[PDB]
Ligand binder design. Structure first.
Ligand SMILES: CCCCCCCCCCCCCC(=O)O
Ligand code: NA
Length: 285
């Protein structure tokens, strides 16, 4: 491996594989979720499996907070003092959190520590695979500049396509424009949303029904992944039967172990609400 002494950061909106969660020098900044005046951190005092029902019994909509910039600063200061030479931070999209813009002033603040915080434009399982890939590339002997190049390609060719049971959480949480709600009919319509090339959640297509929207997610992913080898992830929030159906369609298309399943927990589920489904994709670089 390269003789840099590298630290990798992400936040808990990333869906991290068991592989990645074992890796050295990985720092995950937790995102707290306020429910009825109490602060929860998934994996500490909140399990992902209790979240949707807990939210349904809440007296106001839960609210997420940004990853802690104070803890990022303290960790970076510490890593500098312990002789680390490089830090890579892969955080949730600038289009869904002010955290990315807030940390841009820190990049040059730590003498002797080379820092990069590229805008990943994504979250959830694709973000987690970016983190995984960083370690894979390190294991190939890649240095810091080569890792950044490879990340830049992944970022440019990654997105996710999303359908929610109801647009209320997204609009009320602020990550989807207010207009989008009147954009479209009512209960029945199931718009497909995606991460656009600015990392912002945008309406892709207004679909009339859930059954069609399910098919359309598959058809869109067949198109967007046609050039090369991609990881495709079926991601759901309390929608396991729909997720398994989609996974079966992708396996029948031939995706094999390149298709996997993940879940939306408390952080993303606060914004998407229960009953949500997404297909994420990211090239294997
Ligand atoms: C793959 C689909 C992902 C959908 C993401 C919905 C929006 C999540 C925003 C989470 C913000 C957490 C940190 C914050 O509050 O600033
Ligand atoms: Na392909």
């Amino acid at each position: 491996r390269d003789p840099m002494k590298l630290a990798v950061f992400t936040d808990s909106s990333a869906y991290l594989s068991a592989e990645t969660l074992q890796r050295e020098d990985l720092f995950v900044l937790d995102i707290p979720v306020n429910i009825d005046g109490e602060e929860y951190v998934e994996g500490i005092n909140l399990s992902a499996e209790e979240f949707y029902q807990k939210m349904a019994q809440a007296s106001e909509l839960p609210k997420t907070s940004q990853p802690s910039i104070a803890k990022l600063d303290e960790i970076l200061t510490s890593l500098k003092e312990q002789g680390y030479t490089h830090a890579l931070g892969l955080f949730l999209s600038s289009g869904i959190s002010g955290f990315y813009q807030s940390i841009q002033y820190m990049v040059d603040d730590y003498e002797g520590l080379t820092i990069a915080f590229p805008d990943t434009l994504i979250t959830s399982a694709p973000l987690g695979i970016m983190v995984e890939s960083v370690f894979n590339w390190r294991d190939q002997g890649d240095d810091f500049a080569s890792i950044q190049d490879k990340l830049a390609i992944q970022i440019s060719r990654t997105s996710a396509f999303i359908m929610v049971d109801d647009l209320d959480h997204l609009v009320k949480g602020g990550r989807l424009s207010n207009g989008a709600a009147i954009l479209g009919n009512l209960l029945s319509i199931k718009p497909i949303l995606y991460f656009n090339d600015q990392g912002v959640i945008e309406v892709y297509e207004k679909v009339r029904t859930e059954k069609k929207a399910t098919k359309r997610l598959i058809e869109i992913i067949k198109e967007t992944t046609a050039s090369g080898q991609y990881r495709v992830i079926v991601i759901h929030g309390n929608a396991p039967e729909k997720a398994e159906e989609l996974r079966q369609h992708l396996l029948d298309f031939g995706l094999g172990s390149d298709v996997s399943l993940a879940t939306f927990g408390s952080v993303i589920g606060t914004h998407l609400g229960a009953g949500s489904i997404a297909l994420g994709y990211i090239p294997v670089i």
